[PDB]
C-alpha cells in the first residue's frame, strides 16, 4: 500500500548512489534499514562508527583527515565466528576484506550498501547460521563440480561484492565471470523452509539435512553477470 | 585561474552531500512524521533548489563560459592545434628575416 | 543556453526532481521518473568530469591567446 | 473524470433552516473519525433524513473516459453514458476556499450555485481537490 511503496522508493534512492564518503551518510544509511548505530569518538580528529543489535558487531575506523577508513573490525556473537569476509581469487593470496575495499576504492557507497544489506540478511535469518552456510556452500559446490570432472573454478567474493562466483577457463586463459550464485530473498512468497543442502560424495545426490535449524523465506538462485 | 567556473565548482560540489544526500535526509525525516503541514520536502530542499538557481544565475551572467561549455573536447584540441600554426608561421616569417640579415 | 548541453542537463534534472517530489508529496510515487532521474544524474557526473577537462583546456586556450597577442604586438611594433 | 474523493458519510443531523427546499446536513465519515461534511441539499429532489448513509463522490468530470465548465451545457441525450448514471443526486460547483483547520486537517469549500459545502479531512485523501470546478455526486 503506502508503507511498502515508500520503502521501495527509499530502496531505489539508496540503490542508485547512497551518498559520498562521510560519517553522517554512513549513519543514516545504517539507520534507515532498521539498524540503530552508536558513534564512538576516539578524538577530535578520528572517530569510530559501530552497529550492533544482537549478533553482528561491525566497526569502521573512519578518519576526518584522509577521508578514508583505516580497518574494518566485525565480530560475530553466533556459534560460528570464522565467517569469510575477505576476497578469495586466483593470482595472489592477499587476504583483505570487502568492506575496506568498498569504503576506500569506490567514492560511492553502492557496493557498501549491497554488502550491508547482505550482512543484514545473514544476521536477521541466522537457527540456520547463514555465515557458516555461505562459507561451506562454496566448498560443497566445488566438491560437486569436482565430481562432474569439468573445469568450473569456484571463487568467492569477486567484484568487491559478496557472492559465490562460478567461473570457467576460456580461450584467453583468464577466468571470466559468467554467473554467480548467492542467497536472495524472494518477496513473492516466504514460506519455503530452506534446507542446509549436503551433496553426497558416493551416490552424487543432494540430500536435505535441515531438521530443526531454520531460515525464513530465502533461496539459492542464479543471476547472469 | 578562471573565476566563474571555480565558484560554480565549489557551489554545486562544496569541499559532502552533493544533491541527493540532502533529499534522502529530507524523506528520512518524513519517516518520523507523515501527518503534519510542516512536513513538505520542498521547504528544506529549496536550499538546494536555491543553490540550483544560483548555478543558473552564475552560468547565465557569464559569456566566456557560454562558449567554453558549447564545444566538444576534440573540437577544442583541433582549434588550439590550428591556432598554434599561425604563431608558427609568424615564427618562421621572423626567422627567415633573421636569416636574411645574415 | 541552447548551445551548452549542460544547461538542458540541469533543466531536466530540475524537471525530474520537481515532478518526483510532487508525485511523492501527492502520495503516488512512480518508478519511470526515478529511472529518468538516474539517467540524468549519471550524465550530470560525466558532464562534471568533462567540465573539468574543459577547465584545463580553457587554461591552455588562455595561455596561447595571451602569447599569440603579445607576439602580434611585437610583430606590429617591429 | 476520475473520482477526486469518495467516502461514505453518516448524516448526523439535517437542519431545514428558514428554507423550504434546501436543507443543510451535517455528516461524518464512517471509516474515519476525522473526515466530516457540511452540505446543502435540495431535499425536494433528494430527501435526506438523519442517520442516513450517503456515498459522497467528488469528480472533476462526468464522462467515463479520462480527461484529455468552458463548454456550453447541453441536455443529456438518450443513450448518453455519464458518471451521473450511478448516483441519485449530482451537483456542480466551484471551489472557493482552501482552509487549514489544524496541523493535519484541511478544509475545502465548494459552492454549488450558492449551495455551500464544507469538506474536512486529513490531507492524504483531500489532496486531489484543487481550486477548480468539481461535480458532487451523491447516492444513497
Q: Per-residue DSSP letters for A17-45?
A: ----SSHHHHHHHHHTTT--EEEEESSSS
User: Which residues, in sequence order, are bridge partners of residue D55?
Assistant: D8, D139
Breaks in chain D follow which residues, C to N over 2.5 Å? Answer: 68
> How far from D49 is each of A20, D42, D115, D120, CA to CA, in Å?
63, 12, 18, 21
- Name the 3-class secondary structure at A185: strand
* Distance from C-alpha of A221 to C-alpha of A164, rounded to nearest angstrom: 11
Check if the beta carbon of residue D118 is closer than 8 Å to that of residue D58: no
- The β-bridge relationship of strands D115-119 and D36-42 is antiparallel
Nearest to B73 by CA among C58, C67, C64: C58
Nearest-5° angle of CA A209, CA A212, CA A215? 85
Chain B residues inside the 8 Å CB shell of C29? none
CA dihedral sign of residues A25, A26, A27, A28: positive
Domain of residue D37, CATH code: 2.40.50.140
Q: Which three cell numbers stand for residue A146?
A: 569436482
* Distance from C-alpha of A103 to C-alpha of A128, rounded to nearest angstrom: 29
B56–C60 CB contact, under 8 Å: no
Q: Which residues contact D31 (CB under 8 A, 6 or more apart)?
A: D7, D8
C34–A6 CB contact, under 8 Å: no
Closest CA–CA distance from residue B34 to any residue of chain D (Å): 9
C27–A2 CB contact, under 8 Å: yes
> How far from A122 is each of A96, A109, A164, B29, D69, CA to CA, in Å?
20, 20, 15, 28, 60
B2–C41 CB contact, under 8 Å: no
* Distance from C-alpha of D126 to C-alpha of D95, rounded to nearest angstrom: 13
Buried b (16+ CB within 10 A) or exposed e, B8-47: beeebeeeebbbbbbbbbbbeebeeeeeeeebebeeebee
Annotate D59-115 with DSSP letters as a single string.
Answer: ES-SSSSPP---SPP-PPPTT---GGGG-SEEEEEEEEEEEE-SSSBEEEEEEETTE
B69 CB within 8 Å of a chain D CB: no
User: Which residues, in sequence order, are bridge partners of residue D94?
Assistant: D111, D133
C38–A2 CB contact, under 8 Å: no
Closest CA–CA distance from residue D36 to any residue of chain C (Å): 21
* Distance from C-alpha of D137 to C-alpha of D56, rounded to nearest angstrom: 6
- Exposed, middle or buried: residue D23 (CB in 10 Å: 0-12, 13-18, 19+)? buried
Check if the beta carbon of residue B37 is closer than 8 Å to that of residue D105: no
DSSP 8-state class, residue A86: B
- Name the 3-class secondary structure at A212: coil
* Distance from C-alpha of A67 to C-alpha of A88, rounded to nearest angstrom: 27
Please give the method by which this entry was determined: cryo-EM
Check if the beta carbon of residue A50 is closer than 8 Å to that of residue A57: yes
Range of the domain at D110: 1-140
B 36-55 near D (Cβ less than 8 A): 36-38
B 24-83 near A (Cβ less than 8 A): 24-25, 27-28, 31
Q: Which three cell numbers stand for residue A91?
A: 593470482
Give me the number of domains chain D comprises: 1
DSSP 8-state class, residue D128: T
> How far from D135 is each of A48, B77, D63, CA to CA, in Å?
60, 64, 11
Nearest to A109 by CA among A8, A24, A225: A24
Q: Which three cell numbers stand for residue D84?
A: 451521473
Chains that touch A (3 or more CB pairs under 8 A): B, C
Q: Which of A9, A16, A17 sits opposite C24 (nearest CB)?
A: A9
φ/ψ (deg, to 5) at B63: -105, -20
Alpha-carbon torsion, ordered D31, D64, D91, D76, to 10 deg: -150
Amino acid at each position: 500500500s503506502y508503507v511498502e511503496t515508500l520503502d521501495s522508493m527509499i530502496e531505489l534512492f539508496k540503490d542508485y548512489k547512497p551518498g559520498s564518503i562521510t560519517l553522517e551518510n554512513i549513519t543514516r544509511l545504517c539507520q534507515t534499514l532498521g539498524l540503530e548505530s552508536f558513534t564512538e569518538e576516539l578524538s577530535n580528529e578520528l572517530s569510530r562508527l559501530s552497529t550492533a543489535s544482537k549478533i553482528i558487531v561491525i566497526d569502521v575506523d573512519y578518519n576526518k583527515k584522509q577521508d578514508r577508513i583505516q580497518d574494518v573490525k566485525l565480530v560475530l556473537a553466533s556459534n560460528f565466528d570464522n565467517f569469510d569476509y575477505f576476497n578469495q581469487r586466483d593470482g595472489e593470496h592477499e587476504k583483505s576484506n570487502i568492506l575496506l575495499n568498498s569504503l576506500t576504492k569506490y567514492p560511492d557507497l553502492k557496493a557498501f550498501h549491497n554488502n550491508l544489506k547482505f550482512l543484514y540478511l545473514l544476521d536477521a535469518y541466522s537457527k540456520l547460521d547463514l555465515f557458516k552456510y555461505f562459507t561451506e556452500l562454496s566448498h560443497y559446490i566445488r566438491q560437486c563440480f569436482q565430481d562432474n570432472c569439468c573445469d568450473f573454478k569456484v571463487r568467492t567474493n569477486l567484484n568487491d561484492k559478496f557472492g559465490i562466483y562460478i567461473l570457467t577457463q576460456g580461450i584467453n586463459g583468464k577466468e571470466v565471470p559468467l554467473a554467480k550464485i548467492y542467497l536472495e530473498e524472494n518477496k513473492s512468497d516466504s514460506q519455503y523452509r530452506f534446507y542446509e543442502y549436503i551433496y553426497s560424495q558416493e551416490t552424487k545426490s543432494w540430500i536435505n539435512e535441515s531438521a530443526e535449524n531454520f531460515s525464513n523465506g530465502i533461496s539459492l538462485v542464479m543471476e547472469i553477470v | 585561474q578562471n573565476n566563474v567556473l571555480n565558484q560554480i565548482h565549489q557551489i554545486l560540489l562544496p569541499t559532502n552531500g552533493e544533491f541527493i544526500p540532502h533529499i534522502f535526509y529530507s524523506l528520512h525525516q518524513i519517516r518520523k512524521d507523515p501527518n503534519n503541514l510542516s512536513n513538505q520536502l520542498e521547504t528544506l530542499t529549496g536550499s538546494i533548489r536555491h543553490r540550483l538557481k544560483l548555478c543558473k544565475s552564475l552560468i547565465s551572467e557569464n559569456e566566456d563560459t557560454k562558449d567554453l561549455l558549447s564545444k566538444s573536447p576534440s573540437e577544442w584540441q583541433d582549434i588550439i592545434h590550428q591556432r598554434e600554426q599561425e604563431l608558427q608561421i609568424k615564427r618562421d616569417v621572423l626567422d627567415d628575416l633573421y636569416r636574411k640579415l645574415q | 543556453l541552447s548551445k551548452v548541453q549542460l544547461y538542458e542537463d540541469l533543466c531536466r534534472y530540475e524537471d525530474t526532481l520537481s515532478k518526483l517530489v510532487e508525485s511523492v508529496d501527492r502520495f503516488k510515487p512512480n518508478l519511470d521518473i526515478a529511472k529518468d532521474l538516474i539517467r540524468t544524474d549519471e550524465a550530470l557526473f560525466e558532464n562534471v568530469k568533462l567540465l573539468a577537462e574543459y577547465d584545463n583546456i580553457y587554461r591552455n586556450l588562455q595561455k596561447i591567446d595571451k602569447d599569440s597577442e603579445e607576439l602580434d604586438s611585437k610583430t606590429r611594433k617591429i | 473524470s476520475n473520482t477526486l474523493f469518495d467516502d461514505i458519510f453518516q448524516v448526523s443531523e439535517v437542519d431545514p433552516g428558514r428554507y423550504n427546499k434546501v436543507c443543510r446536513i451535517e455528516a461524518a465519515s464512517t471509516t474515519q473519525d476525522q473526515c466530516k461534511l457540511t452540505l446543502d441539499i435540495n431535499v425536494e429532489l433528494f430527501p435526506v433524513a438523519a442517520q442516513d448513509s450517503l456515498t459522497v463522490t467528488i469528480a472533476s468530470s462526468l464522462n467515463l473516459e479520462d480527461t484529455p465548465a468552458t463548454r456550453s451545457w447541453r441536455p443529456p441525450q438518450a443513450g448518453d453514458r455519464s458518471l451521473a448514471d450511478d448516483y441519485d443526486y449530482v451537483m456542480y460547483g466551484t471551489a472557493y476556499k482552501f482552509e487549514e483547520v489544524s496541523k493535519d486537517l484541511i478544509a475545502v469549500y465548494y459552492s454549488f450555485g450558492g449551495l455551500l459545502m464544507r469538506l474536512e479531512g486529513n490531507y492524504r485523501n483531500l489532496n486531489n481537490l484543487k481550486q477548480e470546478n468539481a461535480y458532487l455526486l451523491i447516492r444513497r
